[PDB]
Amino acid sequence: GPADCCRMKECCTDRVNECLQRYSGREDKFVSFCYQEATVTCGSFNEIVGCCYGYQMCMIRVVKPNSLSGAHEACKTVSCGNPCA
Amino acid sequence: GPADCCRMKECCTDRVNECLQRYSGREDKFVSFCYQEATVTCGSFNEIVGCCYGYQMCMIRVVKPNSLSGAHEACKTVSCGNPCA
Amino acid sequence: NSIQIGGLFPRGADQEYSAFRVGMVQFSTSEFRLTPHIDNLEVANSFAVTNAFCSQFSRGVYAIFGFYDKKSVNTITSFCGTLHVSFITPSFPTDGTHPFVIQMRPDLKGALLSLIEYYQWDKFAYLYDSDRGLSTLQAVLDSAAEKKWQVTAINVGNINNDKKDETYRSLFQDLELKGERRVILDCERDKVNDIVDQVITIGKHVKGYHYIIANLGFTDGDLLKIQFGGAEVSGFQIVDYDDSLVSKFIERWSTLEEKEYPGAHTATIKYTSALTYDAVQVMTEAFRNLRKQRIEISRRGNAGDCLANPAVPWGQGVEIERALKQVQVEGLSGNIKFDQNGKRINYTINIMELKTNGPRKIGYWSEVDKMVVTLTEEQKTVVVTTILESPYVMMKKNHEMLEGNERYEGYCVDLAAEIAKHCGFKYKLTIVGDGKYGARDADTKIWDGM
Amino acid sequence: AFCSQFSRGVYAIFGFYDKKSVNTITSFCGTLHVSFITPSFPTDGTHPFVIQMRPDLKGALLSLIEYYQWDKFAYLYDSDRGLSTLQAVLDSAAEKKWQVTAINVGNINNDKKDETYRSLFQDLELKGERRVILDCERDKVNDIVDQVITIGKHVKGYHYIIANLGFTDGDLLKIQFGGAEVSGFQIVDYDDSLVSKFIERWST
Amino acid sequence: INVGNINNDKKDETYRSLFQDLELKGERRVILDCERDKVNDIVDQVITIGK
Amino acid sequence: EMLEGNERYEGYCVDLAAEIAKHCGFKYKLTIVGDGKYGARDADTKIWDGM
Numbered sequence: 046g047p048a049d050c051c052r053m054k055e056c057c058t059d060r061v062n063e064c065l066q067r068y069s070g071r072e073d074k075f076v077s078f079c080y081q082e083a084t085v086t087c088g089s090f091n092e093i094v095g096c097c098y099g100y101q102m103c104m105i106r107v108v109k110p111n112s113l114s115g116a117h118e119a120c121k122t123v124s125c126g127n128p129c130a
Numbered sequence: 131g132p133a134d135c136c137r138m139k140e141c142c143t144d145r146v147n148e149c150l151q152r153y154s155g156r157e158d159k160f161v162s163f164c165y166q167e168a169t170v171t172c173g174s175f176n177e178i179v180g181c182c183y184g185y186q187m188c189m190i191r192v193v194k195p196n197s198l199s200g201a202h203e204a205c206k207t208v209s210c211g212n213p214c215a
Numbered sequence: 216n217s218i219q220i221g222g223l224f225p226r227g228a229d230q231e232y233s234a235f236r237v238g239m240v241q242f243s244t245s246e247f248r249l250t251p252h253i254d255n256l257e258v259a260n261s262f263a264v265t266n267a268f269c270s271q272f273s274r275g276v277y278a279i280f281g282f283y284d285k286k287s288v289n290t291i292t293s294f295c296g297t298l299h300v301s302f303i304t305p306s307f308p309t310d311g312t313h314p315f316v317i318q319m320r321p322d323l324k325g326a327l328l329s330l331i332e333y334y335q336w337d338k339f340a341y342l343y344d345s346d347r348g349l350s351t352l353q354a355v356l357d358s359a360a361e362k363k364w365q366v367t368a369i370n371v372g373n374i375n376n377d378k379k380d381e382t383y384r385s386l387f388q389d390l391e392l393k394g395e396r397r398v399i400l401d402c403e404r405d406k407v408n409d410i411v412d413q414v415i416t417i418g419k420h421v422k423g424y425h426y427i428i429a430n431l432g433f434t435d436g437d438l439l440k441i442q443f444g445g446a447e448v449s450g451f452q453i454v455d456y457d458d459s460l461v462s463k464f465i466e467r468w469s470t471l472e473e474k475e476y477p478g479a480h481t482a483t484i485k486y487t488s489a490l491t492y493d494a495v496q497v498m499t500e501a502f503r504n505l506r507k508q509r510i511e512i513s514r515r516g517n518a519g520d521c522l523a524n525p526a527v528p529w530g531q532g533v534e535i536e537r538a539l540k541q542v543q544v545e546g547l548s549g550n551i552k553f554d555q556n557g558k559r560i561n562y563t564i565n566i567m568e569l570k571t572n573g574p575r576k577i578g579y580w581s582e583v584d585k586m587v588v589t590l591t592e593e594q595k596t597v598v599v600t601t602i603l604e605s606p607y608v609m610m611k612k613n614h615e616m617l618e619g620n621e622r623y624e625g626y627c628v629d630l631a632a633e634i635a636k637h638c639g640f641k642y643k644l645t646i647v648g649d650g651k652y653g654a655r656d657a658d659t660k661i662w663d664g665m
Numbered sequence: 666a667f668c669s670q671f672s673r674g675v676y677a678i679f680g681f682y683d684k685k686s687v688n689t690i691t692s693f694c695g696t697l698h699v700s701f702i703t704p705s706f707p708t709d710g711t712h713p714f715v716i717q718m719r720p721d722l723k724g725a726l727l728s729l730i731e732y733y734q735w736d737k738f739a740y741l742y743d744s745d746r747g748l749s750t751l752q753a754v755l756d757s758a759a760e761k762k763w764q765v766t767a768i769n770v771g772n773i774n775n776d777k778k779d780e781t782y783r784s785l786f787q788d789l790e791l792k793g794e795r796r797v798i799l800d801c802e803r804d805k806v807n808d809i810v811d812q813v814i815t816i817g818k819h820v821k822g823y824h825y826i827i828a829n830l831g832f833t834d835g836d837l838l839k840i841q842f843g844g845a846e847v848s849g850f851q852i853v854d855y856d857d858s859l860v861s862k863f864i865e866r867w868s869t
Numbered sequence: 870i871n872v873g874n875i876n877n878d879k880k881d882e883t884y885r886s887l888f889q890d891l892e893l894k895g896e897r898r899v900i901l902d903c904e905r906d907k908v909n910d911i912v913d914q915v916i917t918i919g920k
Numbered sequence: 921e922m923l924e925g926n927e928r929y930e931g932y933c934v935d936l937a938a939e940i941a942k943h944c945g946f947k948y949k950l951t952i953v954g955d956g957k958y959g960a961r962d963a964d965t966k967i968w969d970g971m
């Protein structure tokens with residue numbers, strides 16, 4: 046049906062987070078993986094960019110092992126950037 | 131300075147609504163004008179598309195004179211569509 | 216100076232009564248001697264508890280030492296509260312303000328939560344039963360809401376033992392589904408053991424799982440079962456055997472004959488029994504302090520019927536209560552002191568971890584300082600996946616006459632030889648099964664290929 | 666009181682119990698073979714010589730949650746009727762994908778409770794949760810409702826589920842016009858002819 | 870809008886219709902010039918409809 | 921000479937820098953290396969010089 050922006054973002058963050066939860070304690074390794082899955086399920090306007098690029102980057106640089114919850118809670122409000130290129 | 135999505139959308143709807151409030155009874159006529167100004171103030175990833183396209187179309191098709199408040203309240207949750215095209 | 220004190224021992228509790236008698240012998244003095252009246256009952260039965268309590272009351276006991284269950288505990292608290300008779304118990308601490316009750320067992324909540332924070336657990340599983348009450352559950356749920364924890368609360372107490380086989384397999388199946396490894400067991404030792412056996416049976420004791428046993432009896436049960444399993448296990452110990460007091464006590468305990476004192480011949484002692492011993496100490500010191508303060512608590516006449524309405528309490532009771540609560544002594548559970556309500560204060564809960572060689576204390580937990588840590592602490596053949604492409608990997612003409620990496624020739628083969636030569640490992644060249652490089656299937660979302 | 670009734674030689678007893686006293690009643694009625702009938706909450710287990718008038722609310726609640734398709738919500742409970750329902754919805758949350766926030770409102774004293782609720786719903790604002798289940802006695806329900814209206818969370822977008830058989834027993838006129846969805850359970854249908862006649866006699 | 874001519878006995882839905890009509894225009898900013906009692910009444914009705 | 925900061929410099933690596941910083945979401949300040957060398961290890965003092 047119709048595609049959105051806000052919906053895609055909220056879905057993106059949630060799916061990434063829920064995904065990283067299965068990988069607890071190795072979490073810092075799998076961020077890009079879970080972001081890939083999340084981009085697949087939530088869709089993206091540009092396949093390269095993904096659902097939310099900025100959230101992905103913030104998580105990748107911030108996330109430390111077992112620190113997930115706080116990291117996501119800090120990073121989920123971040124600007125996603127341009128979902129074009 | 132990333133422009134995100136949601137922030138831009140909520141900004142778009144808010145500016146459109148706030149602008150259309152200034153024109154009473156002419157509300158259905160000035161929708162495109164206020165959408166132009168709102169896209170200007172909130173910025174857009176594609177200048178042609180605007181901040182939120184689906185909201186613009188929704189307002190244009192729904193809004194009738196003096197019906198502003200309800201029309202906006204109905205149209206502000208709608209999907210914006212593809213921001214890059 | 217005969218001091219009559221009633222006592223309640225659940226049928227099947229031996230070492231507790233043994234340690235009780237040992238306490239009677241060791242803390243005995245020429246000044247005064249405690250004269251216990253022991254009454255065995257069904258602890259879960261409220262009626263039985265009521266009958267026993269009123270029996271002790273009519274006998275005119277100055278204090279009662281006993282046990283309770285989630286079912287019977289309110290009977291004890293209410294009756295002791297009404298008749299002003301002091302009750303001392305090793306059983307789980309009551310959540311609330313209960314007068315005329317002295318709870319020997321320390322509160323485990325703080326130690327547990329601090330332990331969770333120590334291991335940095337964001338998400339885990341909580342297995343509980345309703346025996347000692349849901350107080351701990353409420354605690355970890357409120358703390359889970361506060362600290363943003365995702366906790367799975369599962370009641371294993373309502374599962375019947377007759378029909379429980381596939382129930383636990385399904386339990387840990389659902390638990391494996393979410394990939395949650397970390398698991399906390401808050402249960403009676405029997406249920407714990409059962410769950411453990413189910414775990415080893417289902418092979419959930421392998422590496423990657425972390426179990427936290429919540430109780431003071433971590434070394435009292437058999438840890439040899441999952442010891443070699445390869446999963447981390449952590450827990451709490453209220454009795455330090457490295458202490459001189461506990462060491463000498465244990466020497467005398469081990470020299471005791473099993474025939475006279477049941478289950479008293481052992482290297483260790485259950486924390487409940489130890490708490491009983493320490494309780495005997497507390498009572499002795501209490502009445503001693505009563506005699507030193509020159510206050511006579513002696514009963515003038517018989518107490519009469521406990522049920523008789525309106526109930527009238529004796530005055531002396533309050534004095535005996537204050538006497539007990541003001542006691543501070545040294546014992547197997549460490550420093551023993553009480554607050555106004557009767558809960559334990561200034562306890563030290565040794566935080567212990569099960570390792571390969573055996574259990575070891577990694578730290579201790581205090582009511583103030585929280586968790587404080589004690590003393591800080593071949594070559595496998597590399598599997599090389601590759602695909603056939605020219606001239607990267609190709610089959611030799613004579614390849615049927617050869618075996619292993621000698622079968623393949625190509626750029627990537629030589630490059631593999633070089634990489635292995637520089638990195639210093641033995642390598643096994645293998646061709647990928649599906650014969651693809653790599654991809655994500657749009658349906659199954661599974662990565663295929665090398 | 667029970668032994669008083671017993672010595673008088675009564676053939677049956679009708680009464681109420683609490684989470685504390687219920688074991689006394691069950692044990693005594695079971696031992697002395699005296700039948701006990703009560704409106705109070707059902708005991709969880711098999712207890713003889715007790716006839717529980719109150720129906721089980723668990724199934725209705727869980728099925729309702731499934732009906733509204735709630736993935737995540739907040740569960741407000743107290744320690745008065747027991748944690749049985751809480752344990753139930755937690756186990757069912759474990760079976761399903763549910764994310765449940767359990768908060769104990771029972772240990773909060775009524776004299777000092779003002780900011781306790783503001784902080785409560787503050788923590789509820791943290792997660793942004795707009796779906797909330799109240800499992801409490803009518804009094805706590807009413808108090809929590811008043812606090813909800815005060816902080817203005819009874820407006821549209823919020824969904825409250827009151828768990829009890831007394832949904833119409835408390836005052837609903839308060840949040841009725843608030844614009845927020847409220848759902849609950851009723852064990853007494855006033856549309857029934859029997860109940861209608863009873864009410865006609867009752868009001869007089 | 871004159872809120873003074875409304876009788877206290879029959880006034881329930883009158884305020885609901887008032888603020889509904891006020892919702893029509895989307896009006897948020899509102900000035901109350903009234904006696905303390907009428908002020909209290911209007912305020913309470915505002916809390917009731919959650920505005 | 922009339923500009924200041926990152927506006928002083930232009931080039932391939934500058935634009936690429938802008939892109940990297942835009943992608944990684946940080947504020948960057950372009951600076952020229954002191955010794956004016958790329959990088960090397962002195963065989964004697966074992967000290968790295970350069971960027």
Ligand SMILES: *[C@@H]1O[C@H](CO)[C@@H](O)[C@H](O)[C@H]1NC(C)=O
Nearest residue numbers: 552560561562581582583584
């Ligand atoms: C003993 O307990 C009290 C109660 O919290 C505490 O303030 C005090 O610091 C404790 N003493 C020690 C040595 O832990």
